Design a binder for this molecule. Structure first.
Ligand SMILES: Nc1nnc(-c2ccccc2O)cc1-c1ccccc1
Length: 123
């Protein structure tokens, strides 16, 4: 595939900062790193069923590659992919499950982290 045009540096920096904070997030009481199940998808071969139900699979490793390769052209584009990761979790897993509910929390963490980074960049 053709190399894409680099984003402006501050935009890439904010993308990387947002995703790093979402990844690093830990439940305040328990210390559990909610992102840990979302770093790396299972194989189409350990879990072929995942790929039958989920049209556009994505994990945090893929999101990080899509930042590096400039596939996202705005924070909106990054947000869409994080929220797609979480939607996919919600599609595949049962309401009430650890994976489903953790994805809902990470949606809120993404929003909060983005908001802090945006507010503190407005100078
Ligand atoms: N049940 C799951 N639901 N979702 C993901 C998942 C992982 C990364 C990104 C999005 C996901 O939706 C993984 C499992 C999973 C993990 C290990 C063995 C089997 C399934």
């Amino acid at each position: 595939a053709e190399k894409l045009s680099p984003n402006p540096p501050n935009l890439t920096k904010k993308m990387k900062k947002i995703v790093d904070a979402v990844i690093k997030y830990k439940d305040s009481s328990s210390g559990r790193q909610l992102s840990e199940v979302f770093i790396q998808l299972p194989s189409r071969k350990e879990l072929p069923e995942y790929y039958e139900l989920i049209r556009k699979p994505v994990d945090f490793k893929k999101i990080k590659e899509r930042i590096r390769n400039h596939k996202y052209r705005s924070l909106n584009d990054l947000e869409k992919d994080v929220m797609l990761l979480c939607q996919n979790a919600q599609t595949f897993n049962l309401e009430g499950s650890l994976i489903y509910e953790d994805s809902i929390v990470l949606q809120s963490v993404f929003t909060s982290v983005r908001q802090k980074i945006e507010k503190e960049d407005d100078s």
